[PDB]
Amino acid sequence: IETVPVKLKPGMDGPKVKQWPLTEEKIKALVEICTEMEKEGKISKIGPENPYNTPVFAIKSTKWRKLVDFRELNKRTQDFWEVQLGIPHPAGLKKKKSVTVLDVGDAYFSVPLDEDFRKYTAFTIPSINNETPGIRYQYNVLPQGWKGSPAIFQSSMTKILEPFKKQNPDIVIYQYMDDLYVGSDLEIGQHRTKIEELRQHLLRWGLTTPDKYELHPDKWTVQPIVLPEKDSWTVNDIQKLVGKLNWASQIYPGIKVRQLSKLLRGTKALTEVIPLTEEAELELAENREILKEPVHGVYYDPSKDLIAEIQKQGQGQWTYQIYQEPFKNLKTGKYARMAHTNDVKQLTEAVQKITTESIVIWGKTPKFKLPIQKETWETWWTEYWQATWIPEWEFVNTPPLVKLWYQ
Amino acid sequence: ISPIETVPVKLKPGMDGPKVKQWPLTEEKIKALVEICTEMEKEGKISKIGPENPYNTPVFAIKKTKWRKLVDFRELNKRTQDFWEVQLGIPHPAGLKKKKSVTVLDVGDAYFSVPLDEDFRKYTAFTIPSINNETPGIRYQYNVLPQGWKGSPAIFQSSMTKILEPFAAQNPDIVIYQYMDDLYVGSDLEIGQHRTKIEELRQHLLRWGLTTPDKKHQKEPPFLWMGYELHPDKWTVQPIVLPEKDSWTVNDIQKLVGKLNWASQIYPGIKVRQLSKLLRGTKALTEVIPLTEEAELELAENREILKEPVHGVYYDPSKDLIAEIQKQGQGQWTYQIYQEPFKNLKTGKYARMRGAHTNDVKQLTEAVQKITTESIVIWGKTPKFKLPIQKETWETWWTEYWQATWIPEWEFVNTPPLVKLWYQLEKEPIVGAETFYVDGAANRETKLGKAGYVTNKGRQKVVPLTNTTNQKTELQAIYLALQDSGLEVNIVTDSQYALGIIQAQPDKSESELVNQIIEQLIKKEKVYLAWVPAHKGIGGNEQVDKLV
Numbered sequence: 037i038e039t040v041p042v043k044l045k046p047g048m049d050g051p052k053v054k055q056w057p058l059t060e061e062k063i064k065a066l067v068e069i070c071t072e073m074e075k076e077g078k079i080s081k082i083g084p085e086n087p088y089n090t091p092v093f094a095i096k097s098t099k100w101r102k103l104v105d106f107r108e109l110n111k112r113t114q115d116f117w118e119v120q121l122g123i124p125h126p127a128g129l130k131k132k133k134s135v136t137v138l139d140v141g142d143a144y145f146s147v148p149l150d151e152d153f154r155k156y157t158a159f160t161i162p163s164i165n166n167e168t169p170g171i172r173y174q175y176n177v178l179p180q181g182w183k184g185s186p187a188i189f190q191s192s193m194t195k196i197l198e199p200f201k202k203q204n205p206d207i208v209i210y211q212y213m214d215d216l217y218v219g220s221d222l223e224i225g226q227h228r229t230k231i232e233e234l235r236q237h238l239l240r241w242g243l244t245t246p247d248k249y250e251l252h253p254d255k256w257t258v259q260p261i262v263l264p265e266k267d268s269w270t271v272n273d274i275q276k277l278v279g280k281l282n283w284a285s286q287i288y289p290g291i292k293v294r295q296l297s298k299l300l301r302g303t304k305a306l307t308e309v310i311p312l313t314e315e316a317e318l319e320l321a322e323n324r325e326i327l328k329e330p331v332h333g334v335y336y337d338p339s340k341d342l343i344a345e346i347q348k349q350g351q352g353q354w355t356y357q358i359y360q361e362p363f364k365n366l367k368t369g370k371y372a373r374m375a376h377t378n379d380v381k382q383l384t385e386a387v388q389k390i391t392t393e394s395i396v397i398w399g400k401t402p403k404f405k406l407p408i409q410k411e412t413w414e415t416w417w418t419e420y421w422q423a424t425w426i427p428e429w430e431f432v433n434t435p436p437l438v439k440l441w442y443q
Numbered sequence: 444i445s446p447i448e449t450v451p452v453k454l455k456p457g458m459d460g461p462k463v464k465q466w467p468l469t470e471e472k473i474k475a476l477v478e479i480c481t482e483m484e485k486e487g488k489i490s491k492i493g494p495e496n497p498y499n500t501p502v503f504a505i506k507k508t509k510w511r512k513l514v515d516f517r518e519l520n521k522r523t524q525d526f527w528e529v530q531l532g533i534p535h536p537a538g539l540k541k542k543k544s545v546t547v548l549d550v551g552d553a554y555f556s557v558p559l560d561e562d563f564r565k566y567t568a569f570t571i572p573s574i575n576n577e578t579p580g581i582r583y584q585y586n587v588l589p590q591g592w593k594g595s596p597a598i599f600q601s602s603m604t605k606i607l608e609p610f611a612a613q614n615p616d617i618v619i620y621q622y623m624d625d626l627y628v629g630s631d632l633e634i635g636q637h638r639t640k641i642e643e644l645r646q647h648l649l650r651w652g653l654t655t656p657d658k659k660h661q662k663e664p665p666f667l668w669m670g671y672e673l674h675p676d677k678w679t680v681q682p683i684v685l686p687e688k689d690s691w692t693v694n695d696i697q698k699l700v701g702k703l704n705w706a707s708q709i710y711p712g713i714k715v716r717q718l719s720k721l722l723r724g725t726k727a728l729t730e731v732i733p734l735t736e737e738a739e740l741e742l743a744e745n746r747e748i749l750k751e752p753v754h755g756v757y758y759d760p761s762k763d764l765i766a767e768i769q770k771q772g773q774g775q776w777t778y779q780i781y782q783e784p785f786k787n788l789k790t791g792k793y794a795r796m797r798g799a800h801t802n803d804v805k806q807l808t809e810a811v812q813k814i815t816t817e818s819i820v821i822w823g824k825t826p827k828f829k830l831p832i833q834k835e836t837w838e839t840w841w842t843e844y845w846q847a848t849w850i851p852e853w854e855f856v857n858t859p860p861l862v863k864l865w866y867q868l869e870k871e872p873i874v875g876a877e878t879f880y881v882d883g884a885a886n887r888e889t890k891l892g893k894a895g896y897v898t899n900k901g902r903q904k905v906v907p908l909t910n911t912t913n914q915k916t917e918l919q920a921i922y923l924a925l926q927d928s929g930l931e932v933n934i935v936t937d938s939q940y941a942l943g944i945i946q947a948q949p950d951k952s953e954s955e956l957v958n959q960i961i962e963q964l965i966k967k968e969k970v971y972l973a974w975v976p977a978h979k980g981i982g983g984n985e986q987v988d989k990l991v
């Protein structure tokens with residue numbers, strides 16, 4: 037079949053990212069995978085006159101799967117997959133009471149890739165101890181991970197899916213990278229059989245779907261702030277309470293504490309149980325209600341980038357906020373793992389959970405501010421990564437002054 | 444030359460070949476050039492032609508008995524395409540597997556033995572000048588990889604790699620390593636079989652046009668390679684020479700801090716903390732520097748370590764990989780990687796030199812990270828860890844630390860110094876403890892300031908400060924309250940800065956004030972620090988900010 041021409045953003049040259057060093061086990065797995073892919077035509081070996089590179093990883097099931105980090109190449113072909121062949125995002129998918137995520141990435145592998153473009157998909161299987169130069173391939177078919185693959189394949193997808201869409205004019209189906217997001221309102225039992233219907237339809241047409249993510253987007257909002265609820269109160273408690281309330285002022289600018297501040301006019305001791313005035317309790321109730329409401333002026337901007345910030349809370353508990361401008365939260369949430377756990381395993385899942393929500397709600401991913409040492413994350417993130425996409429990220433070095441502020 | 448396939452080469456987008464002009468020089472040179480270009484045209488490396496080719500590149504001449512031809516390609520290199528980078532880092536001796544026998548083969552004429560893509564030869568054109576520019580020049584061009592062209596190393600390496608393929612196939616027991624113009628061949632074949640295999644390899648390479656040395660010229664162990672000594676059963680660094688001088692220059696401390704880091708891969712315990720401190724704000728390469736007294740002690744202790752040689756062993760994938768860590772003091776750490784308890788695979792050091800305030804446990808973690816990265820690079824796996832810290836110490840710090848941190852299998856080693864949490868703040872305020880409302884402040888212009896406190900028991904102090912900053916006074920306030928209080932004290936401050944430093948639980952710092960605060964924090968039996976917004980009339984605090 038004929039290949040779609042792909043051009044890079046004018047004045048942009050191909051990716052030149054370095055390949056991280058890998059466990060021997062992981063290297064062997066990659067060599068195995070790639071020796072089979074070379075055999076089926078999907079990739080070929082390349083010479084020194086190809087200077088580009090894109091990192092590759094191994095993740096997992098009891099089977100090793102290969103994962104290409106196309107983040108750099110995606111930015112440099114954005115005109116292609118976002119304006120020329122951009123796939124539109126349906127704002128009705130966040131409302132369904134059930135969304136299932138089907139991996140349809142194996143479709144890309146039949147379609148050839150534009151000849152002039154293949155050079156830009158080079159990658160290297162690294163060797164141990166720099167003993168050998170590394171094994172160097174490029175793709176001859178559309179790759180998973182690349183954002184142009186589904187843009188190019190969309191038309192074929194629209195045809196295969198049309199029959200199913202007629203019989204179920206209510207089911208929402210959206211494509212991001214190598215996954216389909218399917219949201220209905222059916223009862224769970226019905227929704228799961230609808231999902232098997234679509235799985236079988238896609239299979240009677242050639243698209244293989246791995247199977248033997250059920251997300252309920254009905255509870256996805258900006259969680260409300262929680263002022264402590266106590267029978268009795270002390271100098272410290274009032275002090276913590278005045279402090280958090282003062283911080284909240286930068287986000288909900290209608291809170292009042294003057295009455296609560298006087299409650300401790302003198303220089304009382306920290307453990308002094310102090311009762312609350314009538315002019316005092318006035319605010320604790322006045323401010324617990326201006327705070328159960330939402331903010332005003334908080335609108336998503338699609339020309340901007342999404343920012344996600346995560347904070348470690350203790351005892352397998354993590355909290356996050358998603359914004360584009362400071363103190364204007366589009367979304368906030370709380371991930372809680374459930375002994376075989378570990379700090380890095382939790383941060384990793386949390387990132388995956390936040391990214392998936394972000395795709396359902398806006399159709400693009402956020403850039404993470406990660407509370408972890410850079411080198412540690414670059415070492416162990418692949419160990420619990422189950423997704424096929426990879427968000428952008430950077431590492432925070434300065435801690436949060438008060439962790440319980442967003443608790 | 445060789446019947447190797449050429450790698451196709453292109454010029455950078457929207458560019459054309461080099462048309463630089465050839466300046467004249469010695470007729471003595473002009474002759475000795477033509478004596479090279481007929482012996483090279485004969486051998487097929489440079490065909491002669493010049494009618495229509497409009498490009499050119501300069502050529503000079505120099506001498507070592509015989510003269511040598513030279514071509515400044517820098518202008519053509521600026522227009523040739525980007526190639527796959529040739530190997531950046533080089534293998535580490537501690538990652539090699541001992542082989543029964545190892546041969547080193549260096550191919551001569553490497554680049555000239557490899558053909559150059561035809562459609563790209565025209566851009567290598569040069570010209571031997573006439574006498575007094577009264578005659579036309581001798582027009583030439585290359586058919587092989589020119590010396591010092593952007594493309595020559597990477598293409599050579601990939602051609603060698605392809606030429607080796609038919610032989611690595613019939614010999615899947617020999618280990619060949621490539622490095623620039625050399626080959627390093629190893630095997631556990633009995634020495635009579637090996638020597639035969641070596642001669643087969645040479646004959647193979649020779650059919651492809653690559654000359655090589657005979658045993659009558661083949662090097663023998665030990666091997667002097669990239670500043671190492673490679674022995675049959677051990678490796679070490681080539682001998683290190685630390686100069687003695689009485690005037691030390693900035694350039695010369697760099698050169699010395701170099702050799703010291705180099706030796707640290709095998710000589711355990713090298714320190715470079717105080718000697719590097721010297722070159723902090725250094726620009727002038729010649730500016731002379733006084734050896735600080737502490738630096739001189741270090742240099743002497745380094746000389747002592749280098750007195751006697753030490754060696755490292757090679758790797759045996761059959762045995763486990765162990766790493767041990769010790770603290771050296773002053774934010775300095777040292778580690779050794781080994782499989783057996785009397786010989787190390789290698790050694791090294793980690794120094795924070797990043798973040799004024801830090802603590803022992805955070806540092807240990809960063810160190811383990813460093814070792815984990817290096818282990819993967821060298822051996823392809825991570826090592827079991829022997830660490831001077833107790834599970835309870837670590838579990839306490841990582842459960843409460845704001846970042847995520849991961850540490851692999853690790854066992855405790857009870858070898859002092861131990862790593863400990865030296866104090867901890869209370870999670871809730873103390874009862875029966877005086878409450879100090881500290882504050883502090885300075886003036887930017889005057890640089891004169893003050894810090895004080897006011898307690899619930901009615902006690903009050905204010906101390907005057909010269910040469911200070913709002914940050915320094917804010918910490919000064921806390922130090923006052925720790926000085927003037929019992930073994931249990933509640934402090935209340937309006938400064939996130941000071942709250943930030945203390946909550947980080949440092950055990951050492953690059954500021955003397957924080958060190959005296961740490962001393963008090965260890966002395967006390969219960970300290971609860973606590974924070975309120977400033978200028979909010981919270982009470983207690985509204986009364987202390989006024990005093991200051």
Ligand SMILES: CCC(=O)N(C)CCOc1ccccc1Oc1cc(Cl)cn2cc(C#N)cc12
Pocket residue numbers: 534539540541542543544545546547618619620627628629630664666667668673674675676
């Ligand atoms: C028993 C061990 C012994 O004598 N050496 C030097 C280490 C074994 O290492 C090799 C293994 C297989 C091919 C070659 C090997 O040697 C070298 C390996 C490397 Cl990676 C670089 N080399 C450089 C030289 C020189 N000169 C020799 C070697």
